[PDB]
Subunit: 180 residues, 6 copies
Amino acid sequence: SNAYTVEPVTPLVAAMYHLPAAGSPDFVGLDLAATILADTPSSRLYHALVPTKLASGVFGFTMDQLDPGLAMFGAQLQPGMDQDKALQTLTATLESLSSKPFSQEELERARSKWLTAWQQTYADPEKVGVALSEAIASGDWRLFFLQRDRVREAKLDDVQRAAVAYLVRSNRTEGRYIPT
Amino acid sequence: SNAYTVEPVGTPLVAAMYHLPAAGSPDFVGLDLAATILADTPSSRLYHALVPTKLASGVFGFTMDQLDPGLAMFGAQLQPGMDQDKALQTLTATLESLSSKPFSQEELERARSKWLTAWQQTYADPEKVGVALSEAIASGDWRLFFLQRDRVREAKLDDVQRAAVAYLVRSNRTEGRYIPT
Amino acid sequence: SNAYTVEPVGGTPLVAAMYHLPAAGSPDFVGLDLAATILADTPSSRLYHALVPTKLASGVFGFTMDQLDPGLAMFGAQLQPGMDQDKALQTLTATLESLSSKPFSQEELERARSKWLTAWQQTYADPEKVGVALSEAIASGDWRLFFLQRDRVREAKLDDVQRAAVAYLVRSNRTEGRYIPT
Amino acid sequence: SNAYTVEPVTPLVAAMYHLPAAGSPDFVGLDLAATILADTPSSRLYHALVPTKLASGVFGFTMDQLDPGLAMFGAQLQPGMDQDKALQTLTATLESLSSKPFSQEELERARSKWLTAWQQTYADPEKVGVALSEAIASGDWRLFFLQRDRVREAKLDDVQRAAVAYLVRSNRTEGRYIPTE
Amino acid sequence: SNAYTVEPVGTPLVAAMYHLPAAGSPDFVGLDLAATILADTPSSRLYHALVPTKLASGVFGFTMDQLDPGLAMFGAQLQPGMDQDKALQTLTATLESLSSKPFSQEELERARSKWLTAWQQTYADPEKVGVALSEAIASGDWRLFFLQRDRVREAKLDDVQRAAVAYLVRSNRTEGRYIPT
Amino acid sequence: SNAYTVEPGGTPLVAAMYHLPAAGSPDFVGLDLAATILADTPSSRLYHALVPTKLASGVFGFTMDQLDPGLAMFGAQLQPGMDQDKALQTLTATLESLSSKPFSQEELERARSKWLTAWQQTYADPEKVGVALSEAIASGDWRLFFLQRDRVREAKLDDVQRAAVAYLVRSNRTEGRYIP
């Protein structure tokens, strides 16, 4: 999944987490969770960061073409903002979701997002060819199809379990971009 | 603006078409954004009204000011057997009774973001900007491409609610059915 | 439908034959849409086979253009310097206007049908593209057309596509033209 | 042609000029001219407007799908920038090319840009169909190839002559967009 | 090559992949072209063997050289309740019994047209070309981007035939099933 | 950067490849930009030395960071008749003689604007940004997607001149030729 949401109204902080096995319920869980966490102003990080003036915009990606595969969350700040506080709020928000469980509505939003994208990919043999090759490079051709099936059958508590299981300190690495 | 959301799982369709306000009206942006709250994502007024209820398999909303007259089109795709008169009726009553379920600020922010994200994609592409400018001239004012953006940027909930309420009425409504024969 | 098929081997003369489309609401419209792909698209197309292995042409093309009023179908051939433009135009129009004695095969229809439906599914999977296709159907006079054209294509019989091409690809509807560079 | 070049780093001014018919041997001259005037940091408009802090960016398009067809040039400014000066500098630049004629280098850059986009169009059957359709809507299907040929054969003097002939005060309309802050 | 063809008028899949010869070997393009004869459009060998027999609903075939080893993968899209054993065995047989049903010139021509049209689209876009040259160099030979093209242009029926029968072999096969949970 | 510019046995081509500096090196952006000036549009150095004079029908220039080691590739497309050795001597001398004909400020602005235009188009599209951050991570540092845009923004003529002259030298030149 790919999310980058910036306010209507450049330093950057990031946090990255190792993903589970490509073919698992947890992987599809965190793919969906990343959308809920970073996509649109309704998302967890935007709501946590922007209205409160700690960040100018937020993003969340799951990057399966890396080995290790990574989920990467972050925020772009304005010139004079507090990187320390921005990074602490970001990781706090991401790592404390048993305190703030996903809603069915949020799950549905992400599921719909994910499946829209798969359908555009499938309708196009050029895109299907790339995706299948990414599947064989991940280890199994069936993944392309398997993952769609996981996403259609995903219940709220799997996705809750995936994110709580993987968005944890022991699996966190931080970054900041501080320009010259 | 552009919305089509279906359920995660030939096909009969029902549609309601509304005339838009003039592109230069300070209600035009109201409707654009309204169509998104109304028809985009599982969270939209139409999806929620038509799909868990099993009245339709998916919903859409489009504003197409490339036409004369300019139009908003909202519709639902049904399954083979679903009651077509029930889907249409629910469809229109959803669109036309927003005074009874008013837009939230969160709904607006959701629609404003999508709109501005689309505008910035147009803007970064000189080919798309040239198209967007000549469409603005075709609607009678080259400024409109930037004016629309500034109006979305400054759009207040009060103004979006009023525009949708003034324009999504039965007297501005043209119904359509497509029944694969 | 849109097709431009070239071979793998002054400037380049082009000859062309123009015909008119049926109304977009007519059964025939998709017939002619599917036909132009059979006539003009890939080395297996009727035009390509008549003009290119025979060395009359460098490539062939076929487009249906309903954004015009009148709506127009355009077929043509790309020439090399030295090739007879009249003999090309001669053969191009003979192929188009004699399908009556050279009827589409089931397999040809399936080739054009598969292409058409793939394009349709790609359009439908994108809200942006659907919004455009819907506005074009409205402009055409029936928002239903976006879906109806699809339904008509998936159910397309060989006899109906033949009859459509045979009634529209006729000399009385035909206007020839040529581009010679410089 | 399409051009929009901004400073590496919502007010706007614009001037718009009627185009000759597509089949006039003036019409590609203006196409190429517009690129010279409006594309990249080497453009006549960028040079006059941007280092001088009258605009953050400039643009220029030929819009042949309008009737009447237009050449549209314009500038985007930051809020405190003098609108009247940017606008007078823009038009002055466009309408005084007899005192600063095109160089062969400029024609070459802009000719390569045109022919590159034409080749990109030509390689896609879908884009060809639309271009052929627009040529027929402009007056003649042959214009699609014939404009390529003219661009290929375009001499500096013809491009000079067409710009100078059509970019004059009797052929232009002005505009400003002053946002409602 | 890419091929994915489905019947017009929650689904299992059965497949078979084979190792390609090295990119730079002469048989490499034969197999690229072969998979198109085999898998692309309703006239393809897989389609005739699996769709009218109602042994499959759609077929695909792709050669993926970015992979190491490179593979050609062929497959069938199934309906719940269709014979999976039979589909795969008819699939694997079709791909392995080509010598009894040799490729026709017309089939070669079709495959070549598609290959070169795609190659021309890559060459037309600097960014794609750079990507393609970059893969060439990773193969250990920049020239390959250009050589493959010339190889395809020259390709003879006899060699495309031998390449396929040399490589689409039970010796070189790995088999797959995807059944929905 | 990617550039291929053509004029209005089969097609032979000749090439010269040079190792790029590290992506995080302050010379990387320099060479990215220099490739544009050297090979993009008729006004490019290679086009001017090779095309008007008829030693080639087109020229090209890429920097390919996704390789290990990263390369600048330059080349020329010839007509069936032309002399390959001459094209290659003229291509290499141009590339290796930039002390003699320094980049202008104008050249640089055209290169920088091209580069930044392509960055804003990526940045505008959340899918594109995700891919670009993956390469950045694969290149060994996520911050590069941004740092390189800041670096292009601030790139001065003399740094760009110096980067190009330092890397486009006889000791870094591997030649190649394609003759059908």
